[PDB]
Amino acid sequence: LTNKKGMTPLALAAGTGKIGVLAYILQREIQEPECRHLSRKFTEWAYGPVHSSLYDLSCIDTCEKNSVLEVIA
Amino acid sequence: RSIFEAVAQNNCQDLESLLLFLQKSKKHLTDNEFKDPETGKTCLLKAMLNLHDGQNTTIPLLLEIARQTDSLKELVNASYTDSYYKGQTALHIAIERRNMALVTLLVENGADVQAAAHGDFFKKTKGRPGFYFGELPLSLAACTNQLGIVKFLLQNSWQTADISARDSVGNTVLHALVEVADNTADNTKFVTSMYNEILMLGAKLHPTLKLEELTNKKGMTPLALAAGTGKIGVLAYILQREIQEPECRHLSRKFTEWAYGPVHSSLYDLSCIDTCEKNSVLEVIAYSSSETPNRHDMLLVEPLNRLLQDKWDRFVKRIFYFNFLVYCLYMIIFTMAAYYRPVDGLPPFKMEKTGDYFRVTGEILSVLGGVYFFFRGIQYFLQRRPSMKTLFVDSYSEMLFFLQSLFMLATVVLYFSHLKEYVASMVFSLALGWTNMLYYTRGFQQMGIYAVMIEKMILRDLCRFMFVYIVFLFGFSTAVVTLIEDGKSSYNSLYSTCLELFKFTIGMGDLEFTENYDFKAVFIILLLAYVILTYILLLNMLIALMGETVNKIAQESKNIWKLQRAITILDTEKSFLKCMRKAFRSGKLLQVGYTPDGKDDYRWCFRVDEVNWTT
Ligand SMILES: CCCC[N@@+]1(CCCCCN2CCCC[C@H]2C(=O)Nc2c(C)cccc2C)CCCC[C@H]1C(=O)Nc1c(C)cccc1C
Numbered sequence: 305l306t307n308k309k310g311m312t313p314l315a316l317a318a319g320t321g322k323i324g325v326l327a328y329i330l331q332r333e334i335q336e337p338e339c340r341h342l343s344r345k346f347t348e349w350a351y352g353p354v355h356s357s358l359y360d361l362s363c364i365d366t367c368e369k370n371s372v373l374e375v376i377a
Numbered sequence: 378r379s380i381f382e383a384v385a386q387n388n389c390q391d392l393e394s395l396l397l398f399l400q401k402s403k404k405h406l407t408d409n410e411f412k413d414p415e416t417g418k419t420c421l422l423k424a425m426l427n428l429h430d431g432q433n434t435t436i437p438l439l440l441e442i443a444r445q446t447d448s449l450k451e452l453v454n455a456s457y458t459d460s461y462y463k464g465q466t467a468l469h470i471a472i473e474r475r476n477m478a479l480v481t482l483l484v485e486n487g488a489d490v491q492a493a494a495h496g497d498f499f500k501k502t503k504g505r506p507g508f509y510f511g512e513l514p515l516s517l518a519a520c521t522n523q524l525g526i527v528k529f530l531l532q533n534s535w536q537t538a539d540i541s542a543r544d545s546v547g548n549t550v551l552h553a554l555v556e557v558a559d560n561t562a563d564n565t566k567f568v569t570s571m572y573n574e575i576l577m578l579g580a581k582l583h584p585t586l587k588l589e590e591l592t593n594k595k596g597m598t599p600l601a602l603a604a605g606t607g608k609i610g611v612l613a614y615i616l617q618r619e620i621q622e623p624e625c626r627h628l629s630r631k632f633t634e635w636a637y638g639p640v641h642s643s644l645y646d647l648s649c650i651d652t653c654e655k656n657s658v659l660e661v662i663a664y665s666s667s668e669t670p671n672r673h674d675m676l677l678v679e680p681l682n683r684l685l686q687d688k689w690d691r692f693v694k695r696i697f698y699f700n701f702l703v704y705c706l707y708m709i710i711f712t713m714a715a716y717y718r719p720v721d722g723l724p725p726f727k728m729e730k731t732g733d734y735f736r737v738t739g740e741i742l743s744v745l746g747g748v749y750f751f752f753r754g755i756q757y758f759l760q761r762r763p764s765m766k767t768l769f770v771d772s773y774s775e776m777l778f779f780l781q782s783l784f785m786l787a788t789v790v791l792y793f794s795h796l797k798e799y800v801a802s803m804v805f806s807l808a809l810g811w812t813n814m815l816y817y818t819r820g821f822q823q824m825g826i827y828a829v830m831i832e833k834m835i836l837r838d839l840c841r842f843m844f845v846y847i848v849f850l851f852g853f854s855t856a857v858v859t860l861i862e863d864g865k866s867s868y869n870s871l872y873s874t875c876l877e878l879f880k881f882t883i884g885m886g887d888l889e890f891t892e893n894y895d896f897k898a899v900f901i902i903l904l905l906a907y908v909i910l911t912y913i914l915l916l917n918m919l920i921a922l923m924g925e926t927v928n929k930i931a932q933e934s935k936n937i938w939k940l941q942r943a944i945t946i947l948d949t950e951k952s953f954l955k956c957m958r959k960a961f962r963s964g965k966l967l968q969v970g971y972t973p974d975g976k977d978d979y980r981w982c983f984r985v986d987e988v989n990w991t992t
Contacts, residue, residue, distance in 0.1 A: 351498075351508055352473050354506070354507075
């Protein structure tokens, strides 16, 4: 959801300079399977002691508008 | 086909009808109709992966279903087929999922405990995802910290795994255990713990087997492998490994002699340590390429530092001093020969006075020393056979002595070709010669650390400062030359003006050196900008950065100096003539105790006397 600045909560946290909120949001991992789709950091396979992880790049990469990278830069 | 789908939900209903269907068709679970065409995925494997709470109920039922088809011994030992996982076995999946009960269950049904999990995924390879563990269920249990499972796999009833079984690369369990460590806290903790555990287990099971001396395909014992790859924690544990159990006491590596009151005499075992052996830990660490991390730190562990210091204080200090003195005389003679060169005609020059005879003798000795250093550099480039990066990034002194020899040989070539230019070459060889005496600062602690810091500055700070300074100097020199009209010392050349603006840096610059322009204001503005940027800003900033660098490399310098002295000691011991090199083996031959079979355990041990005040 966007405010009247068209400025999403992640985008707002990036632009305003709130770093703790940004660190939480970008590595948000949720254990509950009923809402696990919310999270943004997905383990992909955990053979032994190694883990592959996927970080969602939606609204972070420059391909969108008001991306986090562009707003920080 | 959808049996995997049924098992994923842990539904046992469909398998009851599947058993009857199989009895109707008289088929087996291992038939190709039930294996994935590209992976060879079997029903037992799919059941093992899609576990719930660590226990899936369909696994035993599938076991009986296979058994009535007479396929228990074949279904369980089924493996992947795709090259990525080629060799993976359901026992491996049991191990990595950490299911004791399922491991016992599989080993009951005739599971092989020697299945080489040797796919592409299970090989140590940089850049791609993977996990190297030794290609065996024993090794996989070891490298994943299941002490119970390894104890079981070594001491079960159905089938016990082989402790000394090697994989494709030839690693035992100990080699893989070493190769999995990565020098952190908990990793080192558990690696050392289970290394000890497997040593006791091997001592119990095979008391006559020296497990720790098995070598992989490169012929490296686990100790030497730990030294080579840079696993400092494993090395520290192994070299000081002390075991108090009387049955495993012979496995200890750091004993005691007597403990009168508060003072003890601890013996350290020098086997595979002292350079008299092959691939000894000292040689392995000293000659290791710079890629291996912790290379400087690994000399800090007992008894390595004490051993090297003993060698130095006992028979290498004198040899190093003699080498220093000989090089000093060589440079003195070289300098006196070059200084007194005739300054008339073309070379070679005639031998007229007695002074000419002396000078010819000096020239002969100088060329002889240059040839000697040339050949020594060639021999170093052969024996080490270092890579180009290691050649230009690590030696830095074999390179410099070699370069001096190259200049000497170019000098003699030019000298006998009737060229004056020989002088040029010679003076370079002369300058380098003297500035190579910093090498011998290795032999003294304070000066050695000082020279190490000099190196560190030249490489860290001076290079960056020089790049920026060159950019500024060239830019402003071009600007000034452009501004300056006809020079008629005619600073209308780029060289002379670069020199004039360089004079500023050495505190000797002139702000009014030309008077031969059209815009005095522009000239003054340019010179003031240059002075402010380089003299005031850049040079003082360089001083500040050297201060910070000094602050940050206080201990690295000492470590690097100690490693340099280590290399010097090793080379000196190797090169020294045989009439005494054997006469100064380090340590003493002492009867530590008794072998597990029972016999005198004579070892070459190094004695250190220490004191403790908790008694
Ligand atoms: C460049 C530093 C080398 C450090 N180095 C060699 C020391 C030799 C003394 C030479 N001087 C030192 C001080 C001034 C520069 C230089 C010099 O002549 N400049 C120069 C030139 C190039 C032309 C004309 C005129 C001059 C003055 C220190 C001792 C060991 C060898 C090596 C070392 O550090 N090697 C090592 C490593 C890296 C990592 C790990 C282990 C090791 C052994």
